[PDB]
Amino acid sequence: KLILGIVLGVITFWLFAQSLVNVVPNLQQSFGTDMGTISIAVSLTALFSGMFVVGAGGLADKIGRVKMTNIGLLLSIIGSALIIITNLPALLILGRVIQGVSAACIMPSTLAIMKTYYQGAERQRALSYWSIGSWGGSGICSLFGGAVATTMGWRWIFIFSIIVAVLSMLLIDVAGLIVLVVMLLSLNVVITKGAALLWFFGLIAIVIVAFFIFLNVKLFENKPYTGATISNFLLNGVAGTLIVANTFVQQGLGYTALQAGYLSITYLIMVLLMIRVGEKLLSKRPMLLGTFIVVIGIALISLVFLPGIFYVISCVVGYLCFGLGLGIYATPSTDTAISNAPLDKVGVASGIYKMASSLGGAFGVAISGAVYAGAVAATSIHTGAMIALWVNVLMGIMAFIAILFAIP
Amino acid sequence: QVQLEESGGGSVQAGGSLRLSCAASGYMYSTYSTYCMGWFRQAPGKEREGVAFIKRGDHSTYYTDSVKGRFTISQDSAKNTVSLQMNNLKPEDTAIYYCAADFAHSFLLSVHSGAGQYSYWGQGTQVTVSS
Ligand SMILES: [Zn+2]
């Protein structure tokens, strides 16, 4: 139906947003201001998004779902129009900030329409197509923006944002919220400062301080939806597996940038053609299948640390076995969360499931990188790599053990 | 937290040859990304000038006019490091050579040269030539 046809247009408003991150050198000359200041400028999108998606979901919960999805898609016009209009330093900041709060509005609200769309059985067709929207949307955000920068430029990648954000609409109470964003703002850049940096132990405080001040100040959930969310976090911990693998292959074994692309796009095509098999797979069975078969995905790439001549076989099967496992768990976990969550409080509950997904990644990457960067500094590339891949196996096993607290 | 440990260089007679190596510690690649890497020279007289740069992903090299043909930047992929093999060195080449690398980007995007783009810099290695 044209229920998802518009929704995916709002998820592709978050492909164009996270494509410009991989084309920072082009707009450093245009906007003029040096790298390091213009980089953090583009960073603000997923920054503002991660801290407001909870609130913007809880305000969409009351103010209206399609009301907020109308706000977001309208705010996605100015978000892109502001940047593409004129390139200059101070303006570039604000343009990404609103691009960030634009996503915070869309994600939880469009996740609530899906429950109204079906309310059982024909909901899995929608949530699967939603997963295609995000995983395809993020999966090629880089490979797109780069291909666009080559021929057309950095300008014609953000004019596609306004027109798709309109075509989407064509198919259409501060209870510590301020001490929530301050905990997230900090926690979001505790992983980034964790690598860079002191504010290393200093910024961990304002997270823990604004956590307990927010703990005793909408917190009300007790169902398997909790299990589906906690499992989602632990599974996204093995996101680092891919980045540490791409590094190892391209630096250690010394392949070209295109080979890295073929191994990666193989994983991308696989995972997008399993979320389809995910809905057919269904709750606990496929999520146990996914959380398990991903751990194999690692093991095949872990064993490439002790390689041979025909271990490109053992590495490839890894990318496939890793890719499909995410796809299998992909469309059942989003359902088990979206279903069990109360119809009254969907906007609040969905934002929490999406952030728990977000932090999981950033958290996993930080560990995977730090371990790799440490282990490769201590011992070698091949050795140090496996140490990082192993740390992912543990999280992937914990994600398989995280299903223990998720009954049928 | 990405150190650039650089080695080689030093003094030699004019019309001679010199090696300059530089590796990047704990610099990881994103899902469809790479980074560009090379040297800038700066004699006590003139200001910071670009020499030779290479895109780590697909050996996409770029040189300045001055050094074109004599200098040959390249990456020892198995040992993981870039190195600028300099030849027929003229006394203009006498300066402090700084190994640098820019923030990562889509591998589809082209190699970089402008000092504004490069963000990671090495302590600097000295090279001098004479009669
Ligand atoms: Zn570059």
Numbering used by the authors:
A (entry chain A): 10 to 181, 198 to 222, 227 to 246, 258 to 322, 327 to 452
B (entry chain C): 5 to 135
Sentences from the paper on this structure:
In this study, we report the X-ray structure of NorC, a 14-transmembrane major facilitator superfamily member that is implicated in fluoroquinolone resistance in drug-resistant Staphylococcus aureus strains, at a resolution of 3.6 Å. The NorC structure was determined in complex with a single-domain camelid antibody that interacts at the extracellular face of the transporter and stabilizes it in an outward-open conformation. The TM helices are organized in two six-helix bundles, a conserved feature of MFS transporters, with the linker between the helical domains forming two additional TM helices leading to a 6 + 2 + 6 arrangement. The helices 1 to 6 and 9 to 14 are related by a pseudo twofold symmetry that facilitates conformational transitions through the rocker-switch mechanism.
Multiple datasets were merged and scaled together to obtain a complete dataset to a resolution of 3.7 Å. The phases were estimated through Se-SAD phasing. All the 14 TM helices could be modeled, and the main chain was traced with the help of selenium peaks resulting in the correct assignment of amino acids into the density. The structure of NorC is solved in an outward-open conformation with entry into the vestibule blocked by the ICab that was used as a crystallization chaperone. Both aromatic and non-polar residues W23 (TM1), W139 (TM5), W144 (TM5), M116 (TM4) line the vestibule creating hydrophobic pockets as well as regions that can allow interactions with charged substrates. Unlike QacA, NorC lacks any negatively charged residues within the vestibule although a single cationic charge at K398 is observed in the cytosolic half of TM13 whose side chain is positioned facing the vestibule. The ICab that we isolated has a longer CDR1 loop compared to other camelid and llama antibodies and the CDR3 loop harbors a unique Zn2+-binding site. The CDR1 loop has an additional -STYS- motif that forms a β-turn and inserts deep into the vestibule of NorC, to nearly half its depth forming multiple polar and hydrophobic interactions with NorC. While the epitope residues do not display any interaction with the Zn2+ ion directly, it is evident from the NorC-ICab complex that Zn2+-binding allows the CDR3 to have a conformation that facilitates high-affinity interactions with NorC. The ability of ICab to interact with the vestibule results in a substantial reduction of solvent accessibility within the vestibule of NorC, likely compromising substrate interactions.
